[PDB]
Symmetry: D2
Subunit: 386 residues, 4 copies
């Protein structure tokens, strides 16, 4: 019955199940969770591991001795449960000092502090075994046009990421970076707002091989974009280092619903793509149990993230294995899309009268694509009517 | 009184003022315009030049002799008026053969035809003096998830652009390519949907130096993105080869309003950026006079595109020259944003106790950014209340 | 296997399967269909009836004799197949004369013509047995703020609808009106843009009982609104006279996908509501087979509209009949939502210390709503994992 | 220089300038303001009055004696400054007990409490002189489809508002209610999501004359709707009892920017409409100074709200008074829009051959509307280029 096991590589942030329910208009509805309890409960549900921001594990301002105590207790919970920590990240957004950003704050002293806070947590991530270090620049941006010269801000963003790459290289660490785009919220517009902008930026860094993307379902959907298409471009570029799964109903505030909620058909096509492409990284949930829920609802929501992934995986596998679907893909010429347009080369193409002078445009235009039949097979498989 | 001259480099597509007014729900409301008449009328309004798709100048299906006659008459109009042709593009979207795309159609024979149709028009663009060749892949995309394997489609898109680069290089032409992104419409989702995705794609081509972007105001706004921010990223990457100016009211169908309509504040910040960065390319209008208008309204709309640019240029220049604005930019630390975070280097940063151990986070957090005063100065300048 | 029969009351517009594929950027990809052939093909698929605009059945400009011939042939097709015509409407949007509207055109002579064209088609609708007459004011609106004084336009809209009500009453016809809202497209903003605005307007007509709404899935979703919620408000007001079913992926141009495509979960909740409320009107599809398709794809798309409704009906019925769902609805207090807050009356409420002075707010706040468990049961039922 | 005076009727909520800067991702950046200090500072800036939620003035949980002390100090500040309190409202959204709503919470005991909390604050509002009592049902709604039966929720919403109307009538109070719509945030979808839905709902209350709307600029723009058009419909219905002014950049989270920011052209058309229609109620700002700002920035932002209104008022008045604009309005037939379509009556219309049989549709279709010239005059006036 769609039971997860650690082999499915499902991971959760501490801040997901640990969200207390404060929103722009309301107070917390749940008590804080001890990270140790979250690790134990997640392990019981069949998760593989957990992720953290610095400030989720070590309260901001802790002394070195309190920091050591918090880490020790957490490591014991990992040892007791077999849970892993595949990813870590920095909180460069909650504290008022970051109100205009971390890496791109106008104040230079804040930028330096943001780098030092990040470096300290890279060391800890490596100690705990993380392979990916995420950067979500949630305060990098603006509400007004004159507040931020974007060219200068991109110079500062490149400088920061280049320095972090120098750090990991000089220390000999095996950890890679992933940039998490988001278009807006909490800033009016956030820099590097989509997967595309992040991919383009990485190509201007000094050591691009160290950097990839960590796209999030709801973030791209906040710009009305097709999330599977964006993931396909990231895969095509070799840059899908991590992925964040959740749900979102359209263009509005970031809802962080459980995975499978929101756009269910997009969730199907996402799972189809990840499984077909052989993505081997964590399936990470960055979601918020709604503030209507008590703790029993928190764990039901978390379990539902994993359940929905496993149902969609079954349905997408059945779709691709169905001989009638395989025939419909050929009827729609998906096989021809995969063949080179002109492996014969430019000159051969220019000399081929069948490509222009003698091409029957009307006969080609009259051929139906048969896409609606294909899409109804996909619908029937999703719904278990096949 | 804000009178354009050819030195302002304003250009218009033939298909803009020539739009007959057909929309998804309605018939044409205006007669077709002869391109020769459009060139003459635009020259009288103070435009610098015109642009064309192949099929706007030479009716689809024309014989070689009719093609020569259409080109000859057009060249005479250019000679008679002094108008230039800085940009040309291909129509790979109107004819039914392109219903599933040109470069990424599932049918291989259509892909070959699309390349041959494009190459024929590159030759003509060079003959007429164009410096930029635009590609808008308006039919490259899908309405349904199974219809298009995006990784295979990106392979086909790269193959097409690589072949075009081989062609221009082998012929010795001085013309560069610019990719025009759009998120949707007429396809449910279009490949390379934003400036970012296009910039990232270019970095995977064989000769990236030949390719840039041609962003359009309304296209990025159809994804709710900040158009000045996207242009800043394109400028930062060295890839703003051309720009398309129009207006758009939000996330909806592509309205193609005259420039200055839609988001007026974004238009101000765009002009500020283009003029401050020294962009020297054409200021091209890709707009549609609304179908409510007769021909007098067409020319009033076109004139308004240029007028609004010139008013906004004045206001942005006055904003930047105002000593009180210069003081407010320093109060908001725009000067510090332009300074390196750590020109002293990584090791110096790690050893600097003022960046972490002795950094007074509360004092830094208490400093206001003064962004609202700055933004109200910008508003006052835009409105001519300063 | 989810086979429709005429008893399911599925209906289609002639203009749906008859859409030739012209879009803002492209020519037609299919030949025109004779309405007689559409009636025959739809009847074979199991539809119950068809609907029409005047101009779909009788070409604009037809003489009285050609009009009679077109009607006679259509009536024969209805007689031969048993198909019904439950709804008709007027085309007040295609012809250039309607470029600024029909009922709210600034030109008074156009407004009078629009009323006369509508009245002529009301007579024909009654002759063919229609019970509902739809009005979609697709050209009523504006691209610019000064073009339309909305208060005067609403006066003109009320005048038009009041005159139509006087007409039907004076003739003794049993046909009711339904207003079809849409937020934009083809006008920049359309008057009466949502279900809510239309419901409010109706209350100011002279004979409100004659008027209801005809909401369309994709239209409300073009404003990012919850379509089931809007339908619930229409049902609560007694005004759901007809409904138009299709799919839409978010806030963008009107896609008119087949029903079930787009937001699949919203489609589930819509069918749940219609079936639970006992809606007895037609299930009408206002959709467009994508222009990628040939005629075989047209009929596959149409069949898919009906199939998806029937699958969702089964799943929603199974959800509501499941004892575990019934228990979860009580756990979430849906039973208490249905009970009056204060049937004891105002004074009793004011004197009840348990409602304020002695209310334990912390105990009430700590109760979870159990909504995530309920929603995962709904997901499991939708997907056939229960 | 655009200096406000109390005669301009500008008002501000205590929670606007008093917003501490907490957002979904960040802690407060400003200290709390004493309401007395806010009244004094606002009076110095030229505001006319202030508004409050219960919980902004009296901390939740206060004893009767602390409540009396808070009210006394506030009344002294009003007396010392001459500031008025034209509007008050209830906080039915912050405390965890309201996590599923107030008036439409599934738990009946919460619904009763929400009514008692509201009634207590109606008494206080009347004591302080308020004329309008606002209801913003920010927690009335859902994240999931099964959580809320909307028909039952509308019954509960009507019951609540009917009881409040009975209360004010029985006490003899001269205060009216205004419903403030919002489409989403903090709930996934909020009930009564737009001006239209609220207007329609009011018509089903027992005493509709007691209820109107309090629309907010950014709320309607979160659904991509035209705010001036919605205000026009509210004015046409006689229901614009109050208005909330702010700015919003598109369809995203509620930004609450200062008035004039966001969509500047929509702000112009709004002021034109309010001043032309003679709206006499408060011009209330429901905005948030961005959390980047210190207290000096708070007051600069507040001052900017009033400044921008007064600049736009001047520009709109100059637009309407310009003889060239008056001529352009006649050229566009705004005069004919204001004349009845058929004051001659139905029968005369049916017998008028000039309305159909002899109407020259082609001549009418060829007349341009001249809307682009009109809109460029409006642009020139807005920008002070006329």
């Amino acid at each position: 019955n769609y039971q997860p096991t650690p082999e499915d590589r499902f991971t959760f942030g501490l801040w997901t199940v640990g969200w207390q329910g404060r929103d722009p208009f309301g107070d917390a509805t749940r008590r804080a969770l001890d990270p140790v309890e979250s690790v134990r409960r997640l392990a019981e549900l069949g998760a593989h591991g957990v992720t953290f921001h610095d400030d989720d594990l070590i309260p901001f301002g802790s002394s070195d001795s309190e920091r050591e105590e918090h880490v020790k207790r957490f490591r014991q919970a990992l040892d007791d449960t077999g849970m892993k920590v595949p990813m870590a990240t920095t909180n460069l957004f909650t504290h008022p000092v970051f109100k205009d950003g971390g890496f791109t704050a106008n104040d230079r002293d804040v930028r330096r502090y943001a780098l030092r806070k990040t470096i300290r947590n890279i060391d800890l991530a490596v100690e705990l075994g993380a392979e990916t270090y995420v950067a979500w620049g949630g305060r990098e941006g603006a509400e007004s046009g004159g507040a931020k010269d974007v060219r200068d801000a991109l110079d500062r963003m490149k400088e920061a990421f280049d320095l972090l790459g120098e750090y990991v290289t000089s220390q000999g660490y095996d950890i890679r970076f992933a940039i998490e785009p988001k278009p807006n919220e909490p800033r009016g517009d956030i820099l590097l707002p989509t997967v595309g902008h992040a991919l383009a930026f990485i190509e201007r860094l000094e050591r691009p091989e160290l950097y990839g993307v960590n796209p999030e379902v709801g973030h791209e959907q906040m710009a009305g974009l097709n999330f599977p298409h964006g993931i396909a471009q990231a895969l095509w570029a070799g840059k899908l280092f991590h992925i964040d799964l959740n749900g979102q109903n359209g263009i509005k505030y970031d809802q962080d619903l459980r995975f499978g909620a929101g756009d269910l058909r997009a969730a199907f096509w996402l799972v189809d793509l990840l499984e077909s492409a052989g993505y081997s990284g964590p399936r990470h949930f960055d979601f918020k149990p709604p503030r209507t829920e008590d703790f029993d609802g928190v764990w039901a929501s978390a379990a539902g993230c994993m359940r929905n992934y496993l149902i969609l995986k079954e349905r997408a596998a059945a779709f691709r294995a169905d001989p009638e679907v395989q025939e419909a893909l050929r009827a729609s010429r998906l096989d021809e899309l995969a063949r080179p347009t002109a492996a014969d080369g430019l000159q051969a193409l220019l000399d081929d009268r069948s490509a222009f002078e003698e091409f029957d445009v009307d006969a080609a235009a009259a051929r139906g694509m048969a896409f609606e039949r294909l899409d109804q097979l996909a619908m029937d498989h999703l719904l278990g009517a096949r």
